[model samples]
Target: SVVEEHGQLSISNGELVNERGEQVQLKGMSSHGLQWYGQFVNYESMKWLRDDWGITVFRAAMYTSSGGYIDDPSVKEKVKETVEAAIDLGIYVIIDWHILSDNDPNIYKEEAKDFFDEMSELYGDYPNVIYEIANEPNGSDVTWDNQIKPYAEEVIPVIRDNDPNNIVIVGTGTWSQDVHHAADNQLADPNVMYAFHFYAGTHGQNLRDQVDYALDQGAAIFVSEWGTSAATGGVFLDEAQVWIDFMDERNLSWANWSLTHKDESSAALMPGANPTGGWTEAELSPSGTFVREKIR
Candidate 1:
């Protein structure tokens, strides 16, 4: 079978298949890498995940700061550099908008169109990247149908205009938690894939139920954000694992909530940080066995 190229991917049956025709399996963490260290991403940190941890994917925003657009000259170069570095390292990267709060797609469209157009031209040839339209749109279903869809409609064309056939991942409203909305999403391009995030603790069994609904309805989803916080009276890792097991059974790709963190008790900052900047077993197990085994 001949595969058609779209920016960095080919679409068939709603799955984001690579040139090899194998379903892409992405396992990695999210980070505010670019903003933290003044670079779009910490290549060394990503190298730790890619080379040391065996993670095959990572999600980074084109705009490092919230409300910042991809075309913003302040951050565009850094975003591109980080993306290219991940590409060179042979890992699939998800370019997310990081739109977490209630906002119209027009805010993103106004700020991001040129960035996408330019990036589609730059990385359009690669087949290992994915365009995550919105991070988690927190709005009503009405806003989803009226605002979000229109916003996606606007950006999808810009992406298609440059990349022609690349896969675009779209998120439904209510922070992309409504699987029903996702399952019922209608876009002119069938090449589009749906995205739904899972936190498990707040939603619990309800999360699994929604997953089943979305999958049954033929929505191709990839988790763009997730985590557990047992100490903070939040979702424990065990609770989150339920959805993890389900995702594994169904072969859904995922990106965990974070990679490195300033918070120590319940975060994944492998090899541990030291006062003098060195890796140590002590750094790996700050919360003893409890935190260390969360990802394992």
Candidate 2:
């Protein structure tokens, strides 16, 4: 067994068991915030998330390429510090390798392997940590058929070697939307868990179908990403409720799309620019209450 509190999680019967062994019943949030991540990196903003929303899990992403917003040299330090700060606050942290195009982890596998290995060794003793091989894979049918499987086969073992006991989440054929994709592809290790995202926009029922299939596969599934934006025409929240009910029935875990982006149109929960500014009716901060009632 890995040394306790070495930053490693324990696996039992193909599942990750925290110190409590209570199944990672986590309420999580995902963002791209780093120091240069601009709007997302606000340290004060995280207080609202951890203190107000009671989120225990956070997935901060790594952009495949750095944009001009962040200063050079110190950017990595900023990202690591932000992640470390979140851990210090008693939250499990996921370092996402976000790639825009449909590129396999192999494209950056050597770099990612080194990065995650060092991160794992550095934080390996911390139990509340996770690593996502890639954010979203290409969805084009040909790309899914030809590219994804090969990529996963190549990269997953690399992550496992660094942190054998930590939970490793895998993406599906269509950006992990097809929950049952893993049912056919299979994982090299049972420690592997399946994941699917819910927007409830494009063919929502298909999402339910995928969830059922994932359940049948007997793998824990995580709702690692989701949104309520007009852009995807997923503004209506009831569909998300359906997925929530399904997840609740199975005691599955999830993370919402974001926090404090100030985008207004798509933010899950956000306050005004002014600290005491309160909330606008259109802001949908009330939705945060909905999430709290159920998630907490």
Candidate 3:
């Protein structure tokens, strides 16, 4: 049986556990940003990923800037559509607050509280929903103590007050490459996981060691976003394989960087591909082909 039969997910001994307390691993695709890729997030597209792509989870990355959540507040509804589709398909879904540019999640602390308050009230009843409070809290000013942790402290309670039992993921400093920092100073919430993002080409062995460090320190890790390419979307096939193997060894849950048809190399689709699924192999980019193989 798939995740639907497993019931609600929880954290146990630094691993994602099903309702039966059996360790579980989830691998899937994440959207670029709801504002830019909302057209591709319809039910048909999600159904395709669930059926054809062998995906057990879907991540809806609603950005807070760069013409995203804050700029187009309606994007949240678009993400809700994706989450509802995942539930209908009986798959897991992550509601990610794609925080960048602004660097710190506290920039929109009040709005985030309101957002999670509404989302938890609406979708919290379903076990399929997972809340990713902060996408990638980074920059020189951001810190696990003063920034990210505080942000999670505020938003996680809002979710728990409403939903009470769904898994919550918090992003770490240094573009979420600082899992060790978070591990050294873990969050206080139960069933919470830390986000670890990597671009194989840009972040190499040292970064992987940091992940190992986090795990060794008993930190629960969830790779919410990663790419086979460089952080800016350049190709890096060999390194990608290495990172994939590492995650495999640990049974880590992960969501690939994107499901967009943008010009970037990390984009999983060729430009102009249909927004609502049914794309042939010819419609995939190099990164898309690699990730599709991994998914299937």
Candidate 4:
């Protein structure tokens, strides 16, 4: 059981450390978005990934807009389903309030508060659960100083009240790629980490340098979501390999872009693949094979 091995996680100095004060690098998968990919993740599918692929964590990407939470709040139930499975599987789980199309986090600050408040009150006791307040704060108006930090300052306390010591990862600026900005104005929460995302074909050494700056500035980071394809578009393992080396060198944990069978290169399965896991080489898309091989 990963949970038994790691126990409670918190930030130590500038890294994710387990209850025994040992550094933790949790590699796992993030469901595409609960609204669309919810059915693909359940107890059996999650168990299969944990047992077969060696994932120690799972992130439920609960999108806020674009027919997501704000549009249809029932997506929260899908998130809970993933959380329940993670708790049973003894793996870490991230409840990601994915705010992408919404751009600024402040727009839905109140809804996010109530969401965390209720989520924390329900699952706070479970050390396997981690709360990701915002997924990706984008747009020119959403700077770390103005929008992201202020929103985090408002929402993190609600989570802290219930789950005081469990890890809480906040998203950085520019679709979570602006780690330098976050490192410049970091959060003071003891158990918090910054979320950094990338697409292998989309971000290159320049983005690598950006991540390095954050780490140099003493900021603990989590690659909460990344893709083997371009941010907009097929399987680019060469570039992904470079990024993989980057993460391993620094002991940064990550979860690949998606688990669904969407007809995209970033997706992990062939279209119409079985949703309950037990995926074979043929069933796995190219990116899925890459992700599975890396984690194992």
Q: Candidate 1 vs candidate 4: which has greater lDDT? A: 4
In candidate 2, stretches whose alpha carbon ends up further than 4 angstroms from where it belongs are 1-16, 33-39, 42-44, 66-74, 141-146, 230-234, 262-264, 269-271, 274-289
Better of 1 and 3 by lDDT: 3
Positional deviation of residue 210's Cα in model 2 after best superposition, in angstroms: 1.4
- The best candidate by TM-score is 4
* Model 3 lDDT per residue over 43-69, tens place: 998888878888888999999999987
For candidate 3, give the lDDT of residue 285. 89
Candidate 1 residue lDDT tens string, 141-212: 436677778888889898887777766888777777776766776677867877777655566677678877
Q: Lowest lDDT 10-mer window, candidate 3?
A: 1-10
lDDT of 4 at 287: 96
Better of 2 and 3 by lDDT: 3
lDDT, candidate 3, equals: 0.88
User: How high is the lDDT of residue 271 in model 1?
Assistant: 40
Give the candidate order by descending TM-score.
4, 3, 1, 2
* Cα lDDT listed for each candidate: 0.63, 0.60, 0.88, 0.90
Error of 3 at 190 (Å): 1.4
Q: Give candidates' CA RMSD values in order.
A: 4.5, 4.4, 1.2, 0.9
TM-score of each: 0.82, 0.80, 0.97, 0.98
